[PDB]
Amino acid sequence: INGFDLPEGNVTQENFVDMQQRCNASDPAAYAQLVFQTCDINAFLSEAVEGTGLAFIVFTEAITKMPLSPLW
Amino acid sequence: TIEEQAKTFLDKFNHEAEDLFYQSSLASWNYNTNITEENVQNMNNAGDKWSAFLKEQSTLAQMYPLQEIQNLTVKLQLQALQQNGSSVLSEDKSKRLNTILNTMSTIYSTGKVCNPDNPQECLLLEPGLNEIMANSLDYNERLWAWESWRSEVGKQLRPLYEEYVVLKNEMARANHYEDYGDYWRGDYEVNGVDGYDYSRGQLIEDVEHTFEEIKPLYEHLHAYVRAKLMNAYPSYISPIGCLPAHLLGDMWGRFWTNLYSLTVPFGQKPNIDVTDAMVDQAWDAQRIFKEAEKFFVSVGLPNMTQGFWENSMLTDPGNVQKAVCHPTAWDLGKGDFRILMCTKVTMDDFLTAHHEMGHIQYDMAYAAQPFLLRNGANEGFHEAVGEIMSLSAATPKHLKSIGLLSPDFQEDNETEINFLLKQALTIVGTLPFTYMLEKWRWMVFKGEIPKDQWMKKWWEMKREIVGVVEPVPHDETYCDPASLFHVSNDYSFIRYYTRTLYQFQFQEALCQAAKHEGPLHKCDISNSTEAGQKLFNMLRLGKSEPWTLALENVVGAKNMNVRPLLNYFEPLFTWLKDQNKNSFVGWSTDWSPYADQSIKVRISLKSALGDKAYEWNDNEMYLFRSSVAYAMRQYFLKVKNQMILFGEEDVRVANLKPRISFNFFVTAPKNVSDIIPRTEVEKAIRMSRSRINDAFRLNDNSLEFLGIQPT
Amino acid sequence: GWSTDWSPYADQSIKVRISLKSALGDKAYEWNDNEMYLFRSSVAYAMRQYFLKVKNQMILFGEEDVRVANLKPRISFNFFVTAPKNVSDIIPRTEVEKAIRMSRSRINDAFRLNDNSLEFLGIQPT
Amino acid sequence: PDNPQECLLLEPGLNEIMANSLDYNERLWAWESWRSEVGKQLRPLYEEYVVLKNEMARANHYEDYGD
Ligand SMILES: *[C@@H]1O[C@H](CO)[C@@H](O[C@@H]2O[C@H](CO)[C@@H](O)[C@H](O)[C@H]2NC(C)=O)[C@H](O)[C@H]1NC(C)=O
Ligand SMILES: *[C@@H]1O[C@H](CO)[C@@H](O[C@@H]2O[C@H](CO)[C@@H](O)[C@H](O)[C@H]2NC(C)=O)[C@H](O)[C@H]1NC(C)=O
Numbered sequence: 001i002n003g004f005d006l007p008e009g010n011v012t013q014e015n016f017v018d019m020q021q022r023c024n025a026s027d028p029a030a031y032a033q034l035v036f037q038t039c040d041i042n043a044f045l046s047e048a049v050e051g052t053g054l055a056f057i058v059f060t061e062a063i064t065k066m067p068l069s070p071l072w
Numbered sequence: 073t074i075e076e077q078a079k080t081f082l083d084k085f086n087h088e089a090e091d092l093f094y095q096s097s098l099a100s101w102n103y104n105t106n107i108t109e110e111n112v113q114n115m116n117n118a119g120d121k122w123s124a125f126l127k128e129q130s131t132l133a134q135m136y137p138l139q140e141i142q143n144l145t146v147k148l149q150l151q152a153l154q155q156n157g158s159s160v161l162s163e164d165k166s167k168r169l170n171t172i173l174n175t176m177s178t179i180y181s182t183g184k185v186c187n188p189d190n191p192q193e194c195l196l197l198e199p200g201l202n203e204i205m206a207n208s209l210d211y212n213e214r215l216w217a218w219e220s221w222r223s224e225v226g227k228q229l230r231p232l233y234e235e236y237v238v239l240k241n242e243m244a245r246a247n248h249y250e251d252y253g254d255y256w257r258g259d260y261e262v263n264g265v266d267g268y269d270y271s272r273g274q275l276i277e278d279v280e281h282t283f284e285e286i287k288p289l290y291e292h293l294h295a296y297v298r299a300k301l302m303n304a305y306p307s308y309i310s311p312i313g314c315l316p317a318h319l320l321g322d323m324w325g326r327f328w329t330n331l332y333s334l335t336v337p338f339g340q341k342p343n344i345d346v347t348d349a350m351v352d353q354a355w356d357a358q359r360i361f362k363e364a365e366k367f368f369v370s371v372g373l374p375n376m377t378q379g380f381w382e383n384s385m386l387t388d389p390g391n392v393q394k395a396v397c398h399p400t401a402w403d404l405g406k407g408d409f410r411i412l413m414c415t416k417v418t419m420d421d422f423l424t425a426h427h428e429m430g431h432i433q434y435d436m437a438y439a440a441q442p443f444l445l446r447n448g449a450n451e452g453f454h455e456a457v458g459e460i461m462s463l464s465a466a467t468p469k470h471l472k473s474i475g476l477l478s479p480d481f482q483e484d485n486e487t488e489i490n491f492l493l494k495q496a497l498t499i500v501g502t503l504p505f506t507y508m509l510e511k512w513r514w515m516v517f518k519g520e521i522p523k524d525q526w527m528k529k530w531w532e533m534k535r536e537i538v539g540v541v542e543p544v545p546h547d548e549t550y551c552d553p554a555s556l557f558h559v560s561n562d563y564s565f566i567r568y569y570t571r572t573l574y575q576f577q578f579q580e581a582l583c584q585a586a587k588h589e590g591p592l593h594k595c596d597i598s599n600s601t602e603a604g605q606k607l608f609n610m611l612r613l614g615k616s617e618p619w620t621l622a623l624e625n626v627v628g629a630k631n632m633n634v635r636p637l638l639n640y641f642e643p644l645f646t647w648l649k650d651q652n653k654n655s656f657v658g659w660s661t662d663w664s665p666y667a668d669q670s671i672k673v674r675i676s677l678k679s680a681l682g683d684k685a686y687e688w689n690d691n692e693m694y695l696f697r698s699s700v701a702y703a704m705r706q707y708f709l710k711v712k713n714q715m716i717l718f719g720e721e722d723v724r725v726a727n728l729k730p731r732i733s734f735n736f737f738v739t740a741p742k743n744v745s746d747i748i749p750r751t752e753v754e755k756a757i758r759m760s761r762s763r764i765n766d767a768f769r770l771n772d773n774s775l776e777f778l779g780i781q782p783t
Numbered sequence: 784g785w786s787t788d789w790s791p792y793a794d795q796s797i798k799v800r801i802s803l804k805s806a807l808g809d810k811a812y813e814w815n816d817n818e819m820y821l822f823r824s825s826v827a828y829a830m831r832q833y834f835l836k837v838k839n840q841m842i843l844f845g846e847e848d849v850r851v852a853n854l855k856p857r858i859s860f861n862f863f864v865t866a867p868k869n870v871s872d873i874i875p876r877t878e879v880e881k882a883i884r885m886s887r888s889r890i891n892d893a894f895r896l897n898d899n900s901l902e903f904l905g906i907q908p909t
Numbered sequence: 910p911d912n913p914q915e916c917l918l919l920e921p922g923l924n925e926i927m928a929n930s931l932d933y934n935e936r937l938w939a940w941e942s943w944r945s946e947v948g949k950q951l952r953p954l955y956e957e958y959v960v961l962k963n964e965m966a967r968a969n970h971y972e973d974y975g976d
């Protein structure tokens with residue numbers, strides 16, 4: 001979105017790889033100058049937690065996301 | 073038939089047209105020779121008579137469709153007289169268009185720029201602004217004149233030019249043309265000739281093709297000039313970037329002639345100046361004119377009409393007599409060939425005499441053609457004739473045989489490089505300018521460039537084709553192109569491009585007949601009947617034949633080739649390559665004189681608003697510039713205790729994107745040159761950042777002021 | 784006789800009272816010329832939006848077209864909007880009130896104020 | 910305002926309007942424009958003038974320039 005300065009909201013989960021493909025068609029050189037982390041969700045699910053990490057890191061972080069975080 | 077009746081009609085028309093034309097021409101000659109209100113009325117009435125006469129004959133020609141006409145001569149004359157023109161437009165349309173044309177011309181002629189220092193002192197372009205753009209070496213002063221001319225007059229032309237475009241297209245479309253651009257490309261159009269036919273679209277292709285072959289030479293010239301200008305304007309020019317438009321030696325950068333003082337290859341070496349020899353040998357205007365006559369007769373061109381010598385302003389009246397003084401050849405008609413000019417004892421005037429007399433020779437040659445077929449093959453033929461005359465006459469060889477330059481002197485290659493660079497500054501320097509301007513106009517007329525992108529593409533094309541960058545970003549409130557005379561005065565421009573090519577093609581061909589052995593840059597066609605013969609072959613043709621055929625008459629080709637132009641500057645080219653060995657030959661269309669202090673700003677309404685996210689329009693932008701100005705004022709009045717009245721106009725925005733990202737920089741309240749340094753602007757933002765965020769219901773995250781960050 | 788109160792522009796003049804202490808209270812900013820400049824700019828913005836949307840007309844209203852008068856230490860003043868380059872053309876109070884109502888929120892945001900603190904006398908918040 | 914090329918001086922044009930014109934708008938234009946241009950330029954000069962004038966008068970044994 002920043003590399004091609006495209007309108008905010010044009011790229012979604014659906015139009016992303018195709019978007020950057022057409023984007024590379026316009027800017028082939030620049031496309032190679034843009035880092036892109038890999039998103040899998042299953043890889044995220046298949047990431048083992050450290051000992052005691054699940055309770056004092058995983059759950060603690062999820063609760064921060066939860067409302068009235070101090071209650072939970 | 074029909075052809076028979078058409079021919080009969082044209083015959084009668086020509087008889088009356090030539091006589092009435094003569095009366096109009098004679099009247100204009102009289103008024104030019106003596107500027108009097110009585111003479112004003114004389115020329116006006118005579119002109120009105122001829123115009124009305126021509127209009128009536130135009131309708132009569134329409135009664136003779138050229139389709140049934142087989143004879144080319146009658147067909148050509150019919151087609152010329154037939155042309156309806158703007159008459160095709162409705163009364164209201166015609167009247168409005170005429171008013172726009174007059175308003176635009178008046179704004180250009182009467183528009184004034186007042187010194188910011190003293191509002192009482194205001195300069196016009198013609199005298200004051202032009203002097204600054206041609207002499208001033210103050211970056212700030214040049215920048216002021218350049219921007220002020222576009223900010224004051226350019227805006228006044230923007231709306232008029234828009235309407236002009238619309239009406240012009242309508243008229244041409246109604247005259248059976250794709251657009252007004254196509255209407256203008258009709259000059260070079262040839263039909264119903266075996267191999268000599270030429271399409272209006274062909275012109276575009278040919279111009280572009282030829283332009284690609286000159287690019288290399290121009291790139292070297294550009295790189296050389298950039299290097300020199302870097303010394304003249306230090307900390308102002310990037311050695312890899314484009315050239316600031318306000319430093320090109322004139323208001324528009326049409327010619328680079330005024331950059332010679334800063335680009336002279338060999339300062340120690342002067343250039344031939346036989347004006348002193350002229351005055352020393354008492355060279356009066358009549359003497360210099362005779363030398364011109366001698367030259368033409370030497371190449372085998374008919375002797376100047378005794379009448380010419382009798383009736384011709386060859387020198388300033390000097391007495392109470394008031395007469396205009398622009399070198400001009402006159403074909404008054406009925407064998408009347410006069411020259412009007414305030415001639416002086418100067419090398420320039422000597423060469424101007426040759427140029428003017430060149431036109432007379434062309435006139436005399438085609439004077440025996442049908443009244444309507446008495447003109448240069450195309451719009452770039454006549455001027456080229458004049459140019460090659462001055463070329464041959466300027467050669468030190470010519471002057472040394474004209475008895476002005478002691479032949480004992482030896483022409484120095486350094487002085488040759490000197491001469492070649494000076495010529496390149498005028499010839500090669502205008503080629504990209506001319507090309508780009510016509511390209512822009514063509515695309516605008518055909519709609520390729522929309523109104524919202526007129527200024528956008530203008531500056532994109534400038535940075536890419538001409539390699540020239542705007543010192544200040546100009547939005548679609550500007551009309552930079554319209555700030556030039558031709559654009560604001562509805563004149564074609566491709567003539568200049570084509571003429572330049574034709575000129576060099578002619579010169580080479582004629583010199584080949586002259587049997588030149590040395591560098592073409594030092595060729596004298598004087599004393600060559602063969603060169604004169606080829607020249608005459610085209611000269612006598614007039615408009616009777618296709619310009620493609622007239623070309624074959626001299627050069628032997630049917631299209632404009634740039635090879636001879638390159639051949640002429642080949643010595644310079646080789647030299648430039650050496651000087652540009654260390655330098656970067658080319659430019660990057662990214663460097664700008666204002667990019668350094670420009671702050672990039674990305675805006676995320678939907679990120680911070682989602683629903684009820686207002687659309688960022690010009691009003692939102694206006695608000696932003698106002699908010700920035702507010703910040704600047706606060707910062708200065710607080711940190712500097714300085715009450716500086718920053719306005720939204722001082723906030724210069726550029727590179728606006730649908731991401732709502734743009735680059736902006738702040739200038740002094742009334743000083744385009746004074747750009748507030750990014751440091752101060754960053755501090756000002758930091759100080760009022762919250763306030764700005766509040767104004768747009770945004771936050772540091774959404775209102776990304778790239779370079780400014782919370783802590 | 785004559786009334787030193789009557790004014791040729793008073794009819795279309797809109798009174799505005801700003802209550803910084805009522806809203807911001809502690810950490811309230813000081814109203815200066817720059818604050819007044821922002822106000823006129825904000826009004827110009829509002830006028831542009833109103834004409835561009837409701838009237839579908841592009842009128843380049845600037846802070847200069849916003850004519851402020853009777854400025855007081857309670858930050859009260861009468862302002863009237865005028866045509867971009869026509870002093871004689873004063874925008875009717877009705878039209879200006881409509882523009883104010885349309886952009887009231889944004890104006891309040893600009894000064895970090897509220898309809899209660901930012902009182903456009905005659906323009907009634909709903 | 911319509912044509913920026915057409916500019917009037919006080920005596921040649923502005924005075925004729927203020928003396929002859931009966932148009933509210935035209936009279937308002939000339940009146941405000943005269944004070945919105947020349948008047949704004951004189952403001953700073955007059956401020957210094959008043960200072961130097963007061964100085965000279967007081968130096969010549971006077972309460973103020975008006976005295
Ligand atoms: C110039 O004007 C003449 C006259 O209006 C045009 O000739 C007309 O053409 C149309 C279309 O073929 C006919 O319907 C009319 O009857 C013609 N009129 C006459 C008097 O012959 C002519 O086409 C115009 N030329 C251009 C290039 O627009
Ligand atoms: C086509 O028309 C032109 C014009 O009438 C003809 O040119 C004439 O040629 C005769 C014979 O040489 C001359 O006496 C005339 O003076 C010429 N007229 C002009 C105006 O130049 C031409 O010959 C015609 N062509 C044909 C094939 O009939």
Ligand SMILES: *[C@@H]1O[C@H](CO)[C@@H](O[C@@H]2O[C@H](CO)[C@@H](O)[C@H](O)[C@H]2NC(C)=O)[C@H](O)[C@H]1NC(C)=O
Pocket residue numbers: 370469472473474475476598599
């Ligand atoms: C071309 O012809 C002219 C005319 O004959 C030559 O002009 C002569 O120039 C020399 C040098 O200045 C003079 O000494 C002669 O008196 C000139 N002659 C005349 C008749 O004017 C000219 O030199 C010739 N050019 C070349 C290159 O041969």
Ligand SMILES: *[C@@H]1O[C@H](CO)[C@@H](O[C@@H]2O[C@H](CO)[C@@H](O)[C@H](O)[C@H]2NC(C)=O)[C@H](O)[C@H]1NC(C)=O
Pocket residue numbers: 485486487489
């Ligand atoms: C004009 O010609 C002279 C002679 O060829 C050039 O001087 C030469 O320059 C080169 C490069 O610096 C040296 O290698 C030679 O030794 C020089 N020769 C002499 C005799 O000094 C001169 O540079 C040329 N000028 C131009 C404008 O090209």
Ligand SMILES: *[C@@H]1O[C@H](CO)[C@@H](O[C@@H]2O[C@H](CO)[C@@H](O)[C@H](O)[C@H]2NC(C)=O)[C@H](O)[C@H]1NC(C)=O
Pocket residue numbers: 211212743744745746747
């Ligand atoms: C407008 O701004 C320019 C740029 O700051 C000023 O030009 C400066 O002039 C001073 C005095 O001659 C020089 O020392 C600077 O180097 C100049 N700066 C540049 C970038 O050229 C110009 O003087 C200002 N004009 C006014 C009226 O204040």
Ligand SMILES: *[C@@H]1O[C@H](CO)[C@@H](O[C@@H]2O[C@H](CO)[C@@H](O)[C@H](O)[C@H]2NC(C)=O)[C@H](O)[C@H]1NC(C)=O
Pocket residue numbers: 869870871872873911933934
């Ligand atoms: C500037 O604004 C004034 C006020 O609206 C205009 O003057 C009015 O013009 C109309 C049309 O002629 C009249 O009906 C009104 O009576 C006028 N009002 C006054 C107060 O005299 C004026 O025409 C506008 N000027 C321009 C250039 O648009």
Ligand SMILES: *[C@@H]1O[C@H](CO)[C@@H](O[C@@H]2O[C@H](CO)[C@@H](O)[C@H](O)[C@H]2NC(C)=O)[C@H](O)[C@H]1NC(C)=O
Pocket residue numbers: 968969970
């Ligand atoms: C004008 O100048 C003269 C000369 O300086 C002043 O006369 C002097 O006044 C002072 C104060 O009383 C005396 O100390 C001097 O001795 C006087 N000088 C002479 C030459 O007599 C005079 O007062 C000044 N006038 C004004 C209005 O300032």
